[PDB]
């Protein structure tokens, strides 16, 4: 039980803090949405009345 | 009425009545004949009811 034994736990924490300051520098832009429609009916069988 | 040799064929073979049509054209049928009865009623009570 050595140094050696946390290598895998450093590569894991590593990464972490990576993924975490590459998040902070990255810059974000807003989008436009174009896809607002009225485009999601249903269907199916009419209840005719008889008489 | 049926005669007893048809009846025993039918027993023996195990037959059983079979359909390939749906609930919704048998219930559509009764409602059209339901719909002329209306329609008759409706004349008669209009026109012949004295």
Redesign the interface.
């Given at each position: 039980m050595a140094s050696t034994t946390r290598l895998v736990n450093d590569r894991k924490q590593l990464e972490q803090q990576v993924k975490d300051d590459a998040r902070i520098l990255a810059d974000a832009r807003g989008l436009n949405i174009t896809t607002v429609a009225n485009d999601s009916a249903t269907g199916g069988?009419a209840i005719r009345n008889?008489? | 009425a049926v005669e007893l040799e048809q009846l025993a064929a039918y027993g023996l073979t195990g037959a059983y009545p079979r359909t390939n049509h749906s609930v919704?054209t048998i219930v559509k049928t009764v409602?059209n004949i339901?719909?002329t009865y209306?329609t008759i009623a409706q004349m008669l009570s209009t026109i012949d009811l004295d």
């Open positions: 069988q008889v008489g | 919704d409602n339901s719909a209306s």
